[PDB]
Design a protein around this ligand. Structure first.
Ligand SMILES: CCCCCCCCCCCCCCCCCC(=O)OC[C@H](COP(=O)([O-])OCC(O)COP(=O)([O-])OC[C@@H](COC(=O)CCCCCCCCCCCCCCCCC)OC(=O)CCCCCCCCCCCCCCCCC)OC(=O)CCCCCCCCCCCCCCCCC
Ligand SMILES: CCCCCCCCCCCCCCCCCC(=O)OC[C@H](COP(=O)([O-])OCC(O)COP(=O)([O-])OC[C@@H](COC(=O)CCCCCCCCCCCCCCCCC)OC(=O)CCCCCCCCCCCCCCCCC)OC(=O)CCCCCCCCCCCCCCCCC
Ligand SMILES: CCCCCCCCCCCCCCCCCC(=O)OC[C@H](COP(=O)([O-])OCC(O)COP(=O)([O-])OC[C@@H](COC(=O)CCCCCCCCCCCCCCCCC)OC(=O)CCCCCCCCCCCCCCCCC)OC(=O)CCCCCCCCCCCCCCCCC
Ligand SMILES: CCCCCCCCCCCCCCCCCC(=O)OC[C@H](COP(=O)([O-])OCC(O)COP(=O)([O-])OC[C@@H](COC(=O)CCCCCCCCCCCCCCCCC)OC(=O)CCCCCCCCCCCCCCCCC)OC(=O)CCCCCCCCCCCCCCCCC
Ligand SMILES: CCCCCCCCCCCCCCCCCC(=O)OC[C@H](COP(=O)(O)OCCN)OC(=O)CCCCCCCCCCCCCCCCC
Ligand SMILES: Nc1ncnc2c1ncn2[C@@H]1O[C@H](COP(=O)(O)OP(=O)(O)OP(=O)(O)O)[C@@H](O)[C@H]1O
Lengths: 53, 120, 459, 63, 99, 48, 344, 320, 52
């Protein structure tokens, strides 16, 4: 574990992971009309609880 | 303008009504932004005084971060309370004066004739 | 989008915390990867556009500009690598930070839902550009250039803030989806014509119009290079995007408040290309060509037809790529002769027979070569203008003629002729500055192979 | 994921911003009425204090 | 005079490290910068991005539109209907004013 | 090298170190406990 | 000055405004303003040169008249209504005279002619206090009586302050006058909105203080008082150019920095009341306010000027002057726009 | 605890420290007259410390490792080049002159920092009150253009009154041929090739200007060679001086305090020397200046504040 | 006021001789005591625009 001049390669992948997590968090925030839109509005399949998460 | 609001306590940072509001998360983007501002403050302090950066004043940097977060928590709580109060008084006024805010009833696009403006 | 602009922020610690010897490499490679992950938002299998939050959205007009902004950064970063190589490491890293800030702010602009977000970011873009032009320009006119480039913009943009504030006080939201579905026809009064002008004469300055373009030559001529790349590639398009977004709330005033600007654009396009026919400075020739191109985009957006918006998008992207390419090609010689005067060195294609192909292709992009997204744009807006009025082709044809002329004259009096035998300092070539032109041209070929993407809101 | 996500997320964002517009305009008219007439909690400008008046017997009757 | 340094004269590179690429003075850094550029820019971006973009399906609902157009001309001309009537909406649910 | 003029910041001020660290710890501790108390009172006033 | 004297004088300076806030009698308000007056002059006149004597005399003689005019307004109100508070149903002449004298106290145009002079005649400190802390009680008077002021001269004075501050700072090579004309312009922005949501006046005040105090510290670190002296900063203390640049570009309000928030939200609340063209003029002269800041930051940060042979001694020696609050105040300016809803 | 108002209030005053030989004493003279040999013995006998003549390198010696630096950091000046080429276009002469004024100025400041801090006396030699002598010598010759004289006198005007003068001055005189032959018997090829009018103008400047205006504030002790030898007699004269007739008498603890604070900060000391008066002999251009500053911050011991240099051997850097 | 430090602490440094009907030293009425008292007792709870 000597002379870590290469740990900096984790910053941008970390940023990508974090951004994807934040977008996931946002579309969790906006889980309204999830199956109430006049276009799809399908009844839940027998093993289904949420339609698109 | 909300200073003359009834029951308004003078120089009370957080009245007891504000304890009914939900607090922040402590993971709020703005509190971590304030921690980031504190970290950059320590970094700038070291840069100005011809010191190393990200290496020198870890106790000072930690203190900056904690001071910024520990102030932002309570300031954000106060601001949440004030905006809550705004909505509260607005709702109360519309509910007391419905003649000025009538139950409007709008129309459809089949009954109204909006004018056509070609491009051509 | 957040997954695109958080890594872009992480590129800054990647600069500051890396070695002096392993900082250009890491940031360049990771910038290429940001460009790669900026292709997820081309997954539009539907007609409905892509809203990720109240903040961010992405339409088929946003996405090409987004991708091009994320893609230019490695090119700026490699082009900026010969000069400021003997600069101190902190100065290098400051340059890198300014370029990445430009990337981030411009992505945020093209992804914004509200107009105020777009405003504060459209104006925040001024600070990196001014710093780049002024601290790293080579000449002494860079200061006046920065002043011009800043204050034209601010003069145009303060009324824009006033008009947006008015629209918020009138409607309540200032969001673009809601202003689309809730737009009242305007009463056609002076109080609304001033609103039209306040909303438009910030973007029209930045595109630019011919009445007001003096900032663009003074800046292109004096910015080091990467500033010139950006100022030719997306800062001009940052006005066209805004016009295309804001014009929806100005109907029917665009039917009669547009005559002066269409007319100025057309005549001044002819004027600018005639200037390009006769100009001692190569970096000014590219700039006046950019004016003569963006004028068509002005007229096209003013006409507000589908063909016209389409061709505007096509011309936007094509012009950005090919103009950045031409600025790189001129910088390639300026890094040796240290002179912008074109007739100085005029007999190349002996020493640089491969760069002289990139030159040729860059010019053929510039003039109307048909299998190219340049001619598609120019042709479709010509067709829109002919529908508008048949007497505009008389001007577009003069432009086409002069635009063949100045481009081929550039090629000839720079490459063809007898070599300037008194130039021992013509070093062979850089693999770096060959890869630059390859990365500018390969996208043009790909987008020509598939222009279904490069269209806009209307197709 | 699919199209339903984008469609319905857009619908959510639209109701949010529409409600915000409604409330901003409502706040404008509310402030207007409260300032034009002090019927409400806001814009209640101060008056002299009542508790510092002396109600005691004076030296003269017709105080 | 005001005691400034004079202009440093025209550098030549290929004297030192005639395999110079365009990036740095160290011969190792030039190599591992050009390899980085070439790999990350050509071999992943300009290849896999082209693949991704080429294998995006129904870009902006184009193939679907053609298929629907086909079945709809089929239905309309089989059932004797007027293909593509001259009014998007029906007057069954439109109210015009008088005068 | 070894300075002819001995600086001020040669050895630390362990007092300031301890004060800063104890202050940061006390800040975080009061913050977490205040946060728990506020959450609990929010649930207690607004019911569940 | 011995310590007893400094204690007395700084206590008096702190208590002038504090009496002015926590007082319902206008007369104790006047008393606080006079403590601020009396206690400032010793430290203005501390270095004992003709420039300092002139500055102190100009300050004293301009502030005494304003004080007498405020006392006249107060006594006329007492005659009219038998109280020590500006109620409603007072005379607009009384209220306007109060406004005029308060503008003379602040330094607003066309009562601005003394502020740059006085500021040049005194050190960097005593410019900071004069421009930040002395502005707080005179503003408190207006804030306490905001629904009684005429909305016409309140705006003409603001517009004059804007225009004249911009035009005066356009051509000032001295920095101690640039700060003064900046004060004039920002007090203009404040006073324009003061009848319209005076919370924003205090917002602009706090932003202005947070910007000016570290700028004064920057000037203090090398006793820079001229464009040519601040230009020799890429050699002496070059780690400060970043913050100086962002602070100047916040002062001249540019969006990504928090110094644009006060102008933006002021324009908002002014367009909410159909005060449109005035706001347009103000926003268009703030650009000229920005121009000389841009010239300055060219001169110091982007186009490094010639230096001297003797400036290497400064590089040999070491420094201690940055008080650790320059960092906090410079970073809380220039980077706090995304927290603007918590500021408003 | 850095010194300040808090310390002065706690009781670190100054008048408690002065006993009898708490005295700023300067020995002056011409180029070779016996100044160091005399000042050293004065300091030994009376209990002061010797502060040698401030040359091109005093800041370097009192900063960092205390070594000589390359000549482009410690000025851009050479004294040899002044003796072998005194009318250069390259303004080595006034560059040297101003650098040496600044070095004498910092020297006097360090001296006063020591005196008021400790009460121990200080022996200087050829202080900032006697540096104009060489300037006047250069200007009577064509070794200076007159604008440099205005620059020097302005900097003097700005820097001198802030500081207290010496109590006594000791100007030992030698005729010009005597010092010239002494230079010949010194062993320097460069000092050997100096004129006699230069020395005579130094002497005229001293005797005319420096002696009476300092006799208006200080106790002069003019001696000769036969008197300058045997320092013990000069010391025995110093021991019995009535130190009246000067501004030291009207000094309180708080005047000493503010002087001690002005002197504790070398940047405030040297600020008025770094003024932007743009003489070509003093300006060094942005490119050269930046090269020098970078190369200076890429030295051992530099690049950071003193204690914050781990490449030297400093420690506890993450906790300062 | 601006900073109601008096109301915070309940003291009255100056807010008890604000007008005529206010605690004359020995109980001597000022003239218009009744009128001012009545005006003030009307304008209580109300603020400003409605009391005017
Ligand atoms: C997340 C990050 C958050 C942001 C980080 C900081 C950013 C830094 C830039 C800030 C600059 C802009 C600040 C503007 C601002 O604070 O609001 C203006 C704000 C607007 O005033 P207002 O709400 O219209 O009426 C206030 C009344 O006059 C007075 O009536 P009141 O009931 O409102 O009482 C005043 C209140 C004020 O307390 C506050 O919240 C003000 C603190 C702001 C600190 C600035 C940061 O209480 C106190 O003063 C504290 C006393 C506590 C007593 C002991 C417990 O100004 C003040 O209130 C001045 C109060 C001064 C108190 C000292
Ligand atoms: C149906 C509609 C279809 C569209 C038809 C377009 C009609 C318009 C015609 C345009 C005429 C332009 C022209 O005059 O050509 C000038 C141009 C002059 O080049 P040159 O002066 O002879 O180059 C010699 C160097 O000076 C001396 O250096 P060198 O000897 O080492 O050069 C060898 C060679 C080396 O070139 C290469 O190595 C190719 C690099 C790509 C490698 C491919 C990797 C394969 C793996 C992929 C997975 O040339 C180059 O270095 C140029 C590289 C750039 C090639 C650009 C390709 C354009 C294709 C446009 C489509 O002619 C060309 O070589 C370009 C290629 C031919 C144009 C495409 C023909 C149509 C093909 C259908 C697509
Ligand atoms: C944007 C404003 C640009 C203004 C232009 C300033 C300028 O001319 O540069 C000085 C330049 C002089 O060149 P130089 O002699 O090599 O500079 C000596 C350094 O002070 C030598 O400094 P040092 O030897 O003490 O150590 C290097 C120093 C180098 O760091 C610096 O001195 C400046 C770094 C600032 C980077 C800001 C880039 C924008 C970031 C967007 C956010 O510290 C670092 O390593 C940087 C650590 C990471 C960044 C810390 C900055 C936190 C504050 C963030 C504010 C962001 C505002 C935007 O001219
Ligand atoms: C909403 C209603 C409220 C309004 C909104 C709020 C507005 C905020 C307030 C207004 C902000 C402006 C206030 C400016 C204050 C004056 C600043 C100043 O002149 O100091 C310059 C000072 C210069 O520092 P320095 O040059 O390193 O001085 C070192 C001394 O030489 C060190 O040596 P020394 O011997 O000179 O000692 C100095 C002594 C001085 O202590 C004293 O104050 C004298 C009292 C002695 C008692 C006996 O301190 C001590 O050493 C301990 C005392 C014994 O820098 C600052 O004070 C910057 C901070 C400014 C405050 C900004 C906070 C805004 C929030
Ligand atoms: C939108 C970005 C705008 C801004 C510019 C950004 C520049 C950075 C670009 C990064 C790389 C991404 C490039 C994306 C554009 C290319 C996409 C593409 O290649 O299109 C697919 C193309 C045609 O294939 P196909 O899908 O069957 O036909 C489309 C008609 N439906 O498939 C092919 O035919 C490819 C192979 C053809 C090569 C021919 C070479 C001739 C010599
Ligand atoms: N201000 C000045 N300007 C120009 N030259 C100076 C200045 N000060 C000193 N010098 C030069 O520095 C040299 C210093 O010699 P100095 O008179 O100090 O002798 P010393 O070291 O005191 O011992 P001695 O007097 O026995 O030689 C002289 O040659 C003189 O010319």
């Amino acid at each position: 574990q000597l002379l870590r001049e290469h740990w900096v390669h984790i910053l941008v992948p970390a940023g990508f992971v974090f951004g994807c997590y934040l977008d996931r968090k946002d579309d969790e925030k906006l889980t309204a009309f999830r199956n109430k839109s006049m276009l799809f509005q399908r009844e839940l399949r027998p093993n289904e609880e949420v339609t698109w998460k | 303008m909300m200073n003359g609001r009834p029951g308004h306590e003078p120089l009370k940072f957080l009245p007891d009504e504000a304890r009914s509001l939900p607090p922040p998360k402590l993971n709020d983007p703005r509190l971590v932004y304030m921690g980031l501002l504190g970290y950059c403050t320590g970094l700038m302090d070291n840069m100005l005084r011809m010191r190393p950066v990200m290496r020198a004043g870890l106790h000072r940097q930690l203190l900056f971060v904690t001071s910024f977060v520990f102030a932002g928590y309570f300031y954000l709580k106060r601001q949440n309370y004030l905006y809550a109060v705004k909505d509260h008084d607005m709702f109360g006024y519309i509910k007391l004066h419905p003649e000025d805010f009538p139950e409007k009833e709008k129309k459809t696009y089949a009954e109204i004739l909006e004018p056509f403006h070609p491009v051509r | 989008m957040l997954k695109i602009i958080l890594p872009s922020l992480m590129l800054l610690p990647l600069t500051w915390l890396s070695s002096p010897k392993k900082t250009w490499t890491n940031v360049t490679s990771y910038s290429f990867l940001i460009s790669l992950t900026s292709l997820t938002l081309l997954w539009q299998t539907d007609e409905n556009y892509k809203n990720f939050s109240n903040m961010f959205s992405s339409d088929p007009l946003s996405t090409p500009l987004i991708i091009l902004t994320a893609w230019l950064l490695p090119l700026m970063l490699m082009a900026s690598q010969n000069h400021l190589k003997k600069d101190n490491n902190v100065l290098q890293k400051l340059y890198i930070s300014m370029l990445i800030s430009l990337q981030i702010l411009l992505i945020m602009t093209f992804s914004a839902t509200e107009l105020i977000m777009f405003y504060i970011l459209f104006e925040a873009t001024l600070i990196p550009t001014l710093i780049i032009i002024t601290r790293w320009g080579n000449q002494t006119e860079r200061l006046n250039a920065g002043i011009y480039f800043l204050f034209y913009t601010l003069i145009g943009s303060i009324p824009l803030l006033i008009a947006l504030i008015l629209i918020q006080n009138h409607v309540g939201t200032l969001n673009l989806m809601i202003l689309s579905f809730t737009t009242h026809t305007l009463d056609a009064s002076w109080s609304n014509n001033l609103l039209w002008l306040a909303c438009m004469m910030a973007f029209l300055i930045k595109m630019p119009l011919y009445g007001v373009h003096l900032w663009l030559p003074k800046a292109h001529v004096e910015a080091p290079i990467a500033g010139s790349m950006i100022l030719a590639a997306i800062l001009l398009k940052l006005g066209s995007y805004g016009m295309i977004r804001i014009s929806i709330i100005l109907d029917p005033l665009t039917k009669y408040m547009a005559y002066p600007f269409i007319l100025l654009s057309l005549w001044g396009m002819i004027m600018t290309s005639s200037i390009c026919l006769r100009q001692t400075d190569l970096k000014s020739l590219i700039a006046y060509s950019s004016v003569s191109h963006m004028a068509l985009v002005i007229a096209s957006i003013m006409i507000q037809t589908p063909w016209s918006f389409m061709g505007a998008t096509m011309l936007m992207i094509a012009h950005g790529l090919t103009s950045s390419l031409l600025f790189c090609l001129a910088n390639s010689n300026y890094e040796r002769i240290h002179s912008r005067t074109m007739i100085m060195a005029r007999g190349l294609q002996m020493v640089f027979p491969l760069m002289a192909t990139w030159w040729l292709m860059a010019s053929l992009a510039n003039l109307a070569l048909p299998p190219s997204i340049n001619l598609m744009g120019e042709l479709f807006i010509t067709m829109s203008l002919f529908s508008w009025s048949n007497f505009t082709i008389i001007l577009m044809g003069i432009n086409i003629i002069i635009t063949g002329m100045y481009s081929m004259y550039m090629i000839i009096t720079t490459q063809r002729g007898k070599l300037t035998n008194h130039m021992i300092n013509l070093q062979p070539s850089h693999t770096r500055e060959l890869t630059l032109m390859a990365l500018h041209m390969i996208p043009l070929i790909l987008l020509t192979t598939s222009p279904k993407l490069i269209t806009g809101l209307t197709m | 994921d699919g199209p339903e996500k984008n469609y319905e997320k857009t619908l959510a964002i639209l109701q949010i911003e529409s409600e915000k517009a409604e409330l901003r305009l409502k706040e404008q008219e509310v402030r207007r009425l409260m300032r034009a007439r002090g019927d409400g909690p806001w814009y209640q400008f101060p008056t002299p204090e009542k508790e510092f008046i002396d109600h005691s017997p004076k030296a003269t009757p017709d105080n | 005079q005001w005691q400034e340094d004079p202009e440093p004269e025209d550098e030549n590179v290929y004297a030192k490290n005639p395999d110079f690429h365009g990036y740095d003075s160290d011969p190792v850094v030039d190599v591992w910068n050009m390899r980085a550029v070439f790999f990350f820019g050509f071999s992943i971006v300009l290849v896999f991005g082209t693949t991704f973009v080429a294998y995006v399906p129904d870009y902006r609902m184009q193939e679907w539109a053609r298929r629907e157009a086909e079945r709809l001309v089929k239905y309309r001309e089989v059932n004797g209907l007027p293909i593509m009537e001259s009014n998007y909406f029906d007057p069954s649910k439109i109210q015009l004013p008088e005068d | 090298k070894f300075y002819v003029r001995e600086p001020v910041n040669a050895k630390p001020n362990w007092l300031a170190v301890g004060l800063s660290v104890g202050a940061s710890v006390f800040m975080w501790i009061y913050l977490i406990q205040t946060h728990n108390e506020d959450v609990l009172e929010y649930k207690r006033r607004n019911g569940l | 000055m011995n310590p007893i004297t400094l204690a007395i004088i700084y206590f008096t300076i702190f208590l002038g405004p504090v009496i002015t806030m926590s007082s319902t009698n206008l007369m104790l308000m006047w008393v606080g303003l006079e403590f601020s007056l009396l206690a400032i002059i010793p430290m203005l006149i501390n270095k004992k040169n003709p420039r300092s004597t002139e500055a102190a005399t100009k300050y004293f003689v301009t502030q005494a008249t304003a004080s007498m005019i405020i006392l006249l307004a107060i006594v006329l109100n007492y005659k009219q209504l038998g109280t020590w508070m500006f109620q409603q149903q007072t005379n607009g002449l009384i209220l306007n005279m109060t406004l005029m004298a308060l503008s003379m106290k602040l330094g607003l145009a066309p009562f601005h002619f003394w502020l740059p002079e006085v500021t040049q005649g005194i050190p960097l400190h005593m410019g900071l206090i004069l421009l930040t802390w002395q502005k707080i009680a005179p503003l408190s008077i207006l804030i306490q009586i905001y629904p009684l002021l005429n909305s016409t001269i309140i705006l003409m004075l603001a517009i004059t302050s804007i225009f004249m501050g911009a035009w005066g700072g356009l051509n000032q090579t001295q920095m101690r006058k640039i700060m003064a004309y900046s004060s004039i312009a920002h007090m203009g922005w404040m006073l324009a909105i003061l009848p319209y949501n005076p919370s924003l006046t205090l917002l602009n005040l706090m932003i202005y203080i947070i910007l000016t105090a570290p700028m004064f510290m920057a000037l203090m670190l090398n006793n820079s008082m001229t464009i040519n002296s601040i230009s020799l900063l890429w050699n002496k203390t070059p780690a400060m150019l970043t913050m100086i640049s962002l602070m100047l570009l916040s002062l001249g309000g540019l969006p990504p920095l928090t110094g644009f928030l006060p102008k933006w939200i002021i324009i908002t609340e002014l367009m909410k009341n159909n005060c449109l063209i005035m706001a347009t003029l103000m926003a268009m002269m703030a650009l000229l306010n920005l121009f000389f800041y841009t010239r300055l930051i060219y001169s110091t940060s982007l186009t490094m000027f010639p230096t001297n042979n003797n400036s290497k001694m400064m590089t040999h020696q070491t420094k201690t002057k940055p008080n650790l609050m320059f960092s906090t105040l410079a970073i809380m300016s220039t980077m706090t726009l995304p927290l603007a809803p918590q500021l408003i | 605890l850095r010194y300040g108002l808090l310390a002065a209030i706690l009781g670190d005053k100054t008048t408690k420290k002065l006993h009898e030989y708490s005295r700023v004493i300067t020995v002056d003279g011409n180029i070779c007259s016996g100044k160091n040999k005399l000042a050293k013995e004065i300091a030994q006998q009376l209990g002061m410390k010797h502060y040698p003549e401030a040359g091109i390198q005093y800041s370097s010696t009192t900063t960092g490792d205390g070594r000589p630096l390359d000549i482009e950091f410690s000025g851009s000046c050479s004294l040899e080049k002044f003796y072998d080429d005194p009318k250069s276009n390259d303004g080595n002469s006034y560059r040297l002159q101003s650098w040496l004024y600044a070095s004498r100025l910092l020297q006097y400041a360090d001296a006063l920092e020591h005196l008021l801090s400790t009460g121990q006396g200080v022996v200087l030699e050829r202080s900032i009150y006697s540096d104009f002598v060489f300037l006047e010598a250069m200007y009577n010759q064509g070794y200076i253009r007159k604008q440099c004289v205005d620059h020097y006198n302005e900097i003097k005007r700005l820097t001198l009154p802030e500081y207290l003068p010496p109590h006594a001055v000791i100007y030992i005189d030698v005729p010009v041929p005597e010092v010239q032959s002494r230079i010949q018997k010194k062993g320097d090829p460069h000092e050997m090739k100096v004129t006699s009018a230069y020395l005579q103008d130094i002497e005229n400047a001293y005797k005319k200007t420096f002696l009476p205006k300092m006799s208006e504030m200080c106790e002069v002790l003019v001696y000769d060679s036969w008197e300058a030898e045997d320092p013990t007699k000069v010391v025995e004269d110093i021991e019995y001086l009535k130190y009246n007739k000067g501004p030291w008498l009207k000094q309180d603890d708080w005047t000493f305090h503010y002087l001690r604070m002005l002197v504790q900060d070398k940047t405030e000391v040297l600020n008025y020397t770094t003024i932007p008066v743009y003489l070509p002999e003093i300006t060094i251009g942005a490119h050269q200046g930046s090269r020098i500053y970078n190369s200076f911050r890429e030295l051992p011991g530099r690049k950071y504040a003193p204690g914050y240099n781990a490449e030297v051997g400093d420690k506890w850097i993450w906790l300062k | 006021p601006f900073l109601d430090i008096q109301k915070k602490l309940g003291i009255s440094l100056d807010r008890h001789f604000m007008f005529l009907s206010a605690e004359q030293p020995y109980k001597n009425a000022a003239r218009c005591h009744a009128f001012e008292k009545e005006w003030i007792e009307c304008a209580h709870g109300i603020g400003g625009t409605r009391a005017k």
